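Late entry, calcium ion complex.
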Amino acid sequence: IPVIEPLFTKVTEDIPGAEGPVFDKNGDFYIVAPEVEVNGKPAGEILRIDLKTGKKTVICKPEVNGYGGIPAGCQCDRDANQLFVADMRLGLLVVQTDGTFEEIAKKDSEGRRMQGCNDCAFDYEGNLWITAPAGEVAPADYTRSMQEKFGSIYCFTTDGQMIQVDTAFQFPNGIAVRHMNDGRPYQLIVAETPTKKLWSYDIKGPAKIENKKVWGHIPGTHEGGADGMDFDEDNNLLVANLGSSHIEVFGPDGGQPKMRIRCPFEKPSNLHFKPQTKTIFVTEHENNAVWKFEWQRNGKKQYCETLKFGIF
Ligand SMILES: [Ca+2]
Ligand SMILES: [Ca+2]
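Prediction complete; structure with ligand written out below:
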């Protein structure tokens, strides 16, 4: 497997559990620090990083009824400049740039208690596909599916429904949606970290996925595996293989990566493209820092980069 070694440039440092890199509709960059703790208890943070300097500002330190959150993944909304955040303790949150937030669901569409979330991906129809590797949200004692198969997948729909679309995953992690050239959502990709597998489903409609399949295989037997993921404009899927020192690049059809990206660290965690550029910001857990490097092309446009009232 061909490996490229592009130049990684430091962006910012000291972000405990540096995760969920995201750009909003204004080009502002954000990162979540899930692993920040206060006297042993969760106290995760949502930060805005000035790219010109690397200076950090925590806009939100989410807590519900005394229970601190573990914000781990992000997606920027389209119709409003707000961030949808997957929280390992609080479920799904919507955070405003002013730092205020709202817990989205205590329970799902079926009345079952919500599970902690880790990452999410907006399809072009506005539906949010979310991974839930943790057990029940706070106040429930924290648990996570790193060993046992209790990780679930949800689809938070445009009509406000938190629908569990699948269960029994061993730490569902990264997630991405593949679109047809005309913008129609047709395939969901979900990373199952420890098993070294990438799973795929056919998206038949909002919250409707079928034909579960082992779509791709992650290199290595190291502890870790597929974490964050995203598509480039040609639909190649770049996946952070935590513990491998590489970001795998899968072609449109999956299988084995067709190329690997060597990182100057062992734990790449998540990534995100800077809109309209080949620049990919990468978070890692070795130094708890954020970096950025140049990929071969622009990333696939995120939902926030699409237009509600566009003509073409
Ligand atoms: Ca993750
Ligand atoms: Ca991303």
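The radius of gyration is 17 Å. Will revisit in the morning.
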